[PDB]
UniProtKB/TrEMBL annotation, chain A:
Parent-protein residues present: 127 to 462 of 860
Paired cysteines (S-S): 4-20, 80-109, 90-101, 158-192, 158-239, 158-294, 192-246, 192-267, 239-294, 246-267
Ranges where the Human immunodeficiency virus 1 envelope glycoprotein Gp120 domain occurs: 15-314
Compartment(s) of residence: Host cell membrane; Host endosome membrane; Virion membrane
Domain of life from the UniProt record: Viruses
Protein name stated in the entry: Envelope glycoprotein gp160
Family: Belongs to the HIV-1 env protein family.
Post-translational modification: Highly glycosylated by host. The high number of glycan on the protein is reffered to as 'glycan shield' because it contributes to hide protein sequence from adaptive immune system.
Region (CD4-binding loop): 225-235
Function recorded in the entry: Envelope glycoprotein gp160: Oligomerizes in the host endoplasmic reticulum into predominantly trimers. In a second time, gp160 transits in the host Golgi, where glycosylation is completed. The precursor is then proteolytically cleaved in the trans-Golgi and thereby activated by cellular furin or furin-like proteases to produce gp120 and gp41. Transmembrane protein gp41: Acts as a class I viral fusion protein. Under the current model, the protein has at least 3 conformational states: pre-fusion native state, pre-hairpin intermediate state, and post-fusion hairpin state. During fusion of viral and target intracellular membranes, the coiled coil regions (heptad repeats) assume a trimer-of-hairpins structure, positioning the fusion peptide in close proximity to the C-terminal region of the ectodomain. The formation of this structure appears to drive apposition and subsequent fusion of viral and target cell membranes.
Organism: Human immunodeficiency virus type 1 (HIV-1)
Length: 314, 211, 230, 39
């Protein structure tokens, strides 16, 4: 049971951070602990004097914490094959991924592949060639996901501007928990910047490629997502120690037909993570001290389509 | 209030009463008794037109340094109260300017008191009231004692004495009233107001027998 | 050339409506923001509230919503009213303006600035005493100079409460004026004195008119000073 | 740790403590290290 408060700020709200005082335990099994920590609203939930709160995973899955030594940083991985087998690389520039491959070359290992754990956007990966390539297993099915590959990498600067403190509290022997301390100075919130100019041109170079597969002249509209878990509806990824979840809306506010500044997106951080949904086991990501910054290069995309709506309209 | 004192020609620095929370806009204010306040530092270092460059506040380097004024070439006219109004990203609206640091600049030369004693007016003596008024001015420091003498003897009866208070010259001034009647005023040969400053006395004596 | 002027009542009985008016001049009233501030004897500075170009007033919650503020777009006058006054409310009041600063640290779109008010233009101020004792008119007498640079003046005696203002020759005499503090008699009444300096030879040619004004008692005395008949 | 003095174990603030069960012994047993074929 967590006794928490709306975080200290001067009004002008309508929180999400809580000063949480709770009775805890120490390394000595008899004596106990009274401590405070600051938690994001997504890791807890209240229960029904001042309101009381409890963690979100308590009624689902046993929670662990990835120890701060181990990091989450994606490291390029080359998958390799043994003798009597091999790996084949399809190098032809315009390639939709299905059917026969004109350019066939064999290797014993792939290129550097960062196993980026991320959603809605792909970072640091491989770039396409010539036109931006459109790959889908079956495009007549809206349900099947469609993947794209850039010829031009896109820059993004992701930051957690808050200057965090990590409180290491002793639950041991040998156990211990790394909590979040009070922010030092200005209260800001996470965000990532993207150039609007190359963005607008990217959608123009893309919309010319869609008009080969769909219509010679038609209408193309972008809109924000539909619904689901926060790991889908928002953009998940680890930025250096921490897992960011960002609002993507204004990127996709557009309607296209035929013929200087940048953008910014809001973001949220969540520590407790069940990712890959497997129940019975959760994980907690310890907080990282201070302002977090990670720069990413966007090499890919995943999209879905709508439905019948109106015949040959949009 | 927080006492502080600086010497002449030196450099003085005044810390803020509160402490910074978030990035700050520090409003430094100054106050003199009886006068109106003056803004020196707004937006933590910024200075208006007509303010001396001897005064420098603390810039915003992202926390670190607290809010502190810096006065180079301290002068005798620098004695005043000081308020640091801390506007910042966390405490929000600041309805108080903090504490009060009253600066007193020492190192000043000594003056001699200007004393004059007055008889009751021709019209006041017609009002059945006589108030002996003894005025003192231009003395550093402000330590002065006003004593009344009936002939050669001290008068504690009906002694209304004000407090020496700073003038515009950085010296004090004091008034005194002997609460009396037109009779007692004319009853003694010479009424002497004793005003003593720094061991020396400037005494003005009014005799009713002298025009 | 924006300038300001106040007006006090000068005396009020406890639990009565107190009114002060600040006159705006030199500029318009819709360009900037306005404020008032008070201080009690022995205590420190206290903020009150402010009002903006759209005329909506804002107050300090420490006042229990007993304060009301109004400007006049026509008069160029900024008014004030206070009810429910107590003996501890005797104080000195001012009026000033507020430049509205916005101190930006982070992204403005997120509200990562704040609103900091830095004060620039100021005003004079008046004095009011909250007391249950009745007002007492000042006793004005023209103290006669001596014969032997000399000194003359006028007396202000047994008046309640403060302020009492004195002037010479309806404002024709300036250099050399030294006023002295007003003692507090054991009866709760004050007395003050003022003095002006001139050259030795002005006596009898230049008429010295001491103008005494006790505004709480509305006592305006034009009394003249003349040398002794000797 | 600082009536009569109170005490606590030395490992409590360092490492999770186990106990080798009394069945298992610590007695050093001669060991011959060996190599496979081709070596
Ligand atoms: C954490 O935790 C913690 C705990 O701990 C835990 O446990 C342990 C065992 C271990 O394990 C650990 O580890 C853990 O952790 C917690 O805390 C807690 O909490 C709780 C909750 O509940 C609480 O409880 C409570 O209790 C109470 C009692 O009270 C009392 O006592 C206590 C103890 O003892 C205390 O504390 C208190 O305070 C009290 O006492 C008192 O007080 C007072 C005040 O303060 C005082 O006075 C003072 O004095 C001084 C001198 O000296 C000065 O003068 C000053 O000024 C003053 O002030 C006194 O002194 C004292 N005394 C003594 C001490 O002795 C209770 O009460 C409560 O209860 C209530 O409520 C409930 C519900 O909830 C109910 O049920 C009940 O009933 C009650 O109510 C009541 O009722 C009654 C009747 O019966 C009534 O009465 C009446 O009145 C009327 C008038 O009005 C008349 O008179 C009649 O006749 C009558 O009858 C009343 O009114 C009511 N009230 C109300 C309000 O309602 C509760 O139970 C506790 O306390 C705490 N603490 C501790 C234990 O310590 C925490 O929280 C946690 N945390 C987290 C979780 O986070
Ligand atoms: C992703 O994208 C995001 C969105 O783009 C992006 O968010 C951005 O984050 C950055 C931080 O990294 C934010 O940058 C801040 O910007 C603040 C605002 O700066 C502007 O305005 C100030 C103030 O200028 C006054 O006067 C000018 C002109 O006269 C007016 O134009 C202003 O309106 C203002 O007017 C005042 O008076 C008015 C009348 O009363 C008031 O109504 C008004 O409110 C004002 O009070 C200018 O100085 C700025 O110029 C600066 O930037 C330009 C380029 O835009 C440069 O060319 C120039 O060289 C300057 O760098 C600008 O126009 C800044 O205030 C803020 O910097 C202060 O805070 C930071 C953080 O705490 C401190 O580290 C820093 O030291 C600053 O404090 C000093 O300066 C401020 C300036 O006001 C003072 O208030 C303060 O007291 C202190 O000054 C003292 O020390 C200084 C030296 O330290 C000294 O120089 C001073 O003289 C004095 O001694 C910071 O730069 C930015 O706002 C976000 N948003 C946007 C849209 O950009 C995000 O970061 C991106 N992330 C990534 C990963 O990419
Ligand atoms: C979260 O955000 C935090 C705030 O941004 C940030 O931590 C902050 O870290 C800075 C320094 O990095 C620290 O600022 C100062 O720290 C001084 C002591 O630090 C020393 O040594 C450490 C090593 O641990 C170095 O890392 C520092 O750089 C610094 O080294 C010295 O640096 C100077 C700079 O030129 C060099 O000249 C020296 O050679 C070098 N020495 C070395 C390398 O050995 C600390 O002393 C400072 O305090 C003083 O200034 C404060 C105001 O700025 C005053 O309030 C305070 O009273 C001290 O005043 C000093 O008093 C002395 C004796 O009275 C005088 O002699 C000095 O002249 C006088 N100086 C001043 C300027 O007045 C100051 O704190 C921040 O304090 C610290 N903040 C917090 C909240 O921890 C975090 O890193 C961010 N986190 C992340 C993850 O990024
Ligand atoms: C994806 O992006 C979206 C957008 O970024 C996002 O968040 C949602 O954003 C919208 C922004 O508009 C939210 O607000 C909604 O606004 C609706 C429009 O109301 C305006 O217009 C009214 C009249 O419109 C006329 O014309 C329209 C269009 O042709 C027509 O639909 C209308 O019927 C009408 O003819 C107007 O009445 C209204 O207010 C006016 O009148 C009031 C009177 O009180 C006055 O006070 C105002 O000053 C003004 O004059 C306004 O101007 C509104 O209809 C809608 O509310 C209804 O629907 C919601 C949702 O179904 C119901 O909850 C609600 O009870 C109403 O039935 C709403 O207010 C919308 O709220 C946001 N979404 C949420 C959940 O809050 C998504 O979040 C993004 N998703 C992701 C994953 O990023
Ligand atoms: C894509 O987003 C656009 C807004 O994004 C802006 O920029 C980004 C970077 C963010 O900062 C975001 O916060 C910004 O808002 C969005 O364009 C916006 O559209 C609204 C209206 O939908 C504009 O507001 C005003 O609209 C009225 C007309 O609206 C009436 O009719 C509609 C139906 O057609 C009704 O739904 C309404 O209720 C009204 O009855 C215009 O008359 C008005 O124009 C006047 O004022 C603007 C400046 O505000 C001037 O430029 C004009 O000259 C006029 O004087 C507004 O247009 C809002 O201004 C507009 N923003 C911009 C930047 O244009 C766009 O719709 C989104 N695209 C899609 C497909 O959704
Ligand atoms: C987004 O990120 C991607 C990937 O990080 C950028 O895409 C291209 O990345 C490739 C490499 O993956 C670069 O292309 C070649 O890189 C070759 C490998 O270079 C490394 O190994 C060299 C020999 O061992 C070594 O010399 C070299 O060091 C060089 O760079 C160092 C900094 O990284 C610098 O300190 C050294 O002095 C030296 O300059 C590397 O360790 C290299 O041999 C080839 O010459 C060639 O560079 C591409 O240049 C990257 N860029 C492009 C446009 O293709 C992608 O650019 C990023 N996008 C954005 C928008 O930032
Ligand atoms: C900080 O904690 C407080 C604890 O209550 C939260 O305050 C609550 O805020 C909601 C608004 O989301 C209030 O509901 C509102 O009620 C009014 C009046 O009926 C109604 O007009 C509004 O439409 C809305 O329903 C709620 O009353 C209020 N709680 C109390 C006790 O007043 C606050 O939201 C917390 N801050 C954050 C960031 O969570
Ligand atoms: C992917 O591209 C190939 C051409 O490289 C498409 O062509 C198909 O090729 C196979 C040969 O295995 C033929 O049997 C099919 O009849 C061809 N179909 C067409 C439409 O040309 C293949 O269709 C493409 N697939 C998608 C989903 O676009
Ligand atoms: C993201 O941040 C990087 C720096 O962290 C920015 O890189 C700068 O780019 C400009 C040109 O736009 C160069 O002149 C600078 O030298 C670069 N600096 C560094 C340190 O590389 C990049 O522009 C940012 N992009 C966005 C969209 O904000």
């Amino acid at each position: 049971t967590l006794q928490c408060t709306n975080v200290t700020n001067n009004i002008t709200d309508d929180g999400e951070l809580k000063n949480c005082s709770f009775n805890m335990t120490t390394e000595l099994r008899d004596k106990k602990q009274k401590v405070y920590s600051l938690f994001y609203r997504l890791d807890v939930v209240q229960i029904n004097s001042n309101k009381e709160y409890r963690l979100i995973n308590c009624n689902t899955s046993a929670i662990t914490q990835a120890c701060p030594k181990v990091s989450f940083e994606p490291i390029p991985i080359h998958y390799c094959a043994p003798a009597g087998f091999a790996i084949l690389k399809c190098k032809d520039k315009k390639f939709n991924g299905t059917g026969p491959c004109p350019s066939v070359s064999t290797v014993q290992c792939t290129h550097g592949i960062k196993p980026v754990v991320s959603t809605q956007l792909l970072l640091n990966g491989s770039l396409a060639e010539e036109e931006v390539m459109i790959r889908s297993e079956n495009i007549t099915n809206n349900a099947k996901n469609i993947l794209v590959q850039f010829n031009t990498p896109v820059q993004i600067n992701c930051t957690r501007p808050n200057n965090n403190t990590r409180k290491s509290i002793r639950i041991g022997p040998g156990q211990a928990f790394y909590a979040t301390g009070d922010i030092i100075g200005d209260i800001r919130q996470a965000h990532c910047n993207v150039s609007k100019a190359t963005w607008n041109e990217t959608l123009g170079k893309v919309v010319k490629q869609l008009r080969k597969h769909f219509g010679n002249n038609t209408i193309i509209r972008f809109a924000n997502s539909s619904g689901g878990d926060l790991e889908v509806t928002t953009h998940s990824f680890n930025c250096g120690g921490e897992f960011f979840y960002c609002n993507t809306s204004g990127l996709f506010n557009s309607t296209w037909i035929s013929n200087n500044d940048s953008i910014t997106l809001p973001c949220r951080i969540k520590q407790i993570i069940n990712m890959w949904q497997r129940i019975g086991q959760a994980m907690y990501a310890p907080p990282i001290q201070g302002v977090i910054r990670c720069v990413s290069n966007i090499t890919g995309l995943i999209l879905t389509r709508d439905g019948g709506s109106t015949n040959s309209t949009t | 209030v927080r006492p502080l004192s600086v010497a002449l020609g030196e450099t003085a620095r005044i810390s803020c009463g509160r402490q910074a929370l978030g990035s700050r806009a520090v409003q430094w204010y100054q106050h003199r008794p009886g006068q109106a306040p003056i803004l020196l530092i707004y937006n933590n270092q910024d200075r208006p037109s007509g303010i001396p460059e001897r005064f420098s506040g603390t810039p915003d380097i992202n926390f670190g340094t607290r809010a502190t004024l810096t006065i180079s070439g301290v002068e005798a006219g620098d004695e005043a109260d000081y308020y640091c109004h801390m506007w910042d990203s966390r405490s929000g609206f600041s309805w108080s300017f903090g504490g009060a640091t009253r600066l007193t600049v020492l190192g000043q030369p000594k003056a001699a008191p200007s004393v004059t004693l007055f008889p009751p007016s021709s019209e006041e003596l017609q009002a059945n009231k006589a108030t002996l008024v003894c005025l003192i001015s231009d003395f550093y420091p402000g330590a002065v004692t006003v004593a009344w003498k009936a002939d050669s003897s001290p008068v504690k009866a009906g002694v209304e004495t004000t407090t020496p208070s700073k003038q515009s010259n950085n010296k004090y001034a004091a008034s005194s009233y002997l609460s009396l009647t037109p009779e007692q005023w004319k009853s003694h040969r010479s009424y002497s107001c004793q005003v003593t400053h720094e061991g020396s006395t400037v005494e003005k004596t009014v005799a009713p027998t002298e025009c | 050339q924006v300038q300001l002027q106040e007006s006090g009542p000068g005396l009020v009985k406890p639990s009565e409506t107190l009114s002060v008016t600040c006159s705006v001049s030199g500029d318009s009233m819709n360009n900037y923001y306005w404020t008032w501030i008070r201080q009690s004897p022995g205590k420190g500075l206290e903020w009150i509230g402010y009002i903006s170009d759209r005329e909506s007033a804002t107050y300090n919650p420490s006042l229990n919503s007993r304060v009301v503020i109004s400007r006049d777009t026509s008069k160029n006058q900024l008014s004030l009213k206070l009810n429910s006054v107590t003996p501890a409310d005797t104080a000195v009041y001012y009026c000033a303006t507020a430049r509205r600063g916005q101190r930006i640290y982070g992204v403005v779109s997120f509200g990562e600035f704040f609103y900091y008010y830095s004060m620039d233009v100021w005003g004079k101020g008046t004095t009011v005493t909250v007391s249950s004792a009745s007002t007492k008119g000042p006793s004005v007498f023209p103290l006669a100079p001596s014969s032997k640079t000399a000194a003359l003046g006028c007396l202000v005696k047994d008046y309640f409460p403060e302020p009492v203002t004195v002037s010479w020759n309806s404002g024709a005499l300036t250099s050399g004026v030294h006023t002295f503090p007003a003692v507090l008699q054991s009866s709760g009444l004050y007395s003050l004195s003022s003095v002006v300096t001139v050259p030795s030879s002005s006596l009898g040619t230049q008429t010295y008119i001491c103008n005494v004004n006790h505004k709480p008692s509305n006592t305006k005395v034009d009394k003249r000073v003349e040398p002794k008949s000797c």
